[PDB]
């Protein structure tokens, strides 16, 4: 139960919900065909378009509730330790980030922190270790102009049952400067890219004693592979 609710560019805190299309509530989206799977549920929107340069270090801040922790010593801030799973980042080219409809956009994945079989660590584990933040670099090669940056936590604690995997989502409205000439080799539709019966969505991640280690097996994240320049 968390909400990506704040961007940071090379450390520069862009402000709570500045240029964010983010849910009001922290309830999970579980129907992978739902329109809520693009930028999460409808709720907060913004008129800001975050000015970034191709290559910048984007940090995305997840917290239990809007504002941060729901109460002093909140055990589920930034997210509950049980919510093991990957975190994923997509881009989609638009004319005007502020106006653009979230529907029908051609998405492409730029980054993912999935699972490490050896160290037994998930994307969410790093999320928590980084006090809610998730850092990644915007690819150098992408072409200038407006994008929707779509960061997405996938929690797989109950994902052993069909349609019980949990998706947490939000979109930063951004604009890219000092870019290249990379158009994606292929794109994916949202909703559409994820199938409920995927190895990464329908999956039991619990080992013998019941620890969420995926029996030290390599996780296969949903959607396309991250791009490369
Ligand atoms: Cu939850």
UniProtKB/TrEMBL annotation:
Its cofactor is Cu(2+). Belongs to the polysaccharide monooxygenase AA9 family. It comes from Thermothelomyces thermophilus (strain ATCC 42464 / BCRC 31852 / DSM 1799) (Sporotrichum thermophile). The keyword Glycosyltransferase does not apply. GO terms for molecular function: hydrolase activity; metal ion binding; monooxygenase activity. Cu(2+) 1 binds at residues 1, 83. Cu(2+) 2 binds at residues 1, 83, 168. It is found in: Secreted. GO terms for cellular component: extracellular region. Residues 1-207 form the Auxiliary Activity family 9 catalytic domain. It catalyses: [(1->4)-beta-D-glucosyl]n+m + reduced acceptor + O2 = 4-dehydro-beta-D-glucosyl-[(1->4)-beta-D-glucosyl]n-1 + [(1->4)-beta-D-glucosyl]m + acceptor + H2O. This is lytic cellulose monooxygenase (C4-dehydrogenating). It is an enzyme of class 1 (oxidoreductase). It comes from the Eukaryota. It holds the Pfam family AA9. Disulfide bonds join 39-171, 141-229. Its EC number is 1.14.99.56. Keywords: Carbohydrate metabolism, Cellulose degradation, Copper, Disulfide bond, Hydrolase, Metal-binding, Monooxygenase, Oxidoreductase, Polysaccharide degradation, Secreted, Signal. One of its GO terms (biological process) is cellulose catabolic process.
């Amino acid at each position: 139960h968390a909400i990506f609710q704040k961007v940071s560019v090379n450390g520069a805190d862009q402000g709570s919900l500045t240029g964010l299309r983010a849910p009001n509530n922290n309830n999970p989206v579980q129907n992978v065909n739902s329109q809520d799977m693009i930028c999460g549920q409808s709720g907060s929107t913004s008129n800001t378009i975050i000015e970034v340069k191709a290559g910048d270090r984007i940090g995305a801040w997840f917290q239990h509730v809007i504002g941060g922790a729901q109460f002093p010593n909140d055990p589920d801030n930034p997210i509950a330790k049980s919510h093991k799973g990957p975190v994923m980042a997509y881009l989609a080219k638009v004319d005007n980030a502020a106006t653009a409809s979230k529907t029908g956009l051609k998405w492409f994945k730029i980054w993912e922190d999935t699972f490490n079989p050896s160290t037994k660590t998930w994307g969410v584990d790093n999320l928590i270790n980084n006090n809610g933040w998730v850092y990644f670099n915007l690819p150098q090669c992408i072409a200038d102009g407006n994008y929707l940056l779509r960061v997405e936590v996938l929690a797989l604690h109950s994902a052993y049952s069909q349609g019980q995997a949990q998706f947490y989502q939000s979109c930063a409205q951004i604009n890219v400067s000092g870019g290249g000439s990379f158009t994606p080799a292929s794109t994916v539709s949202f909703p559409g890219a994820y199938s409920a019966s995927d190895p990464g969505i329908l999956i039991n991640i619990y080992g013998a004693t019941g620890q969420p280690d995926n029996n030290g097996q390599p996780y296969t994240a949903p959607g396309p592979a991250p791009i490369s320049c």
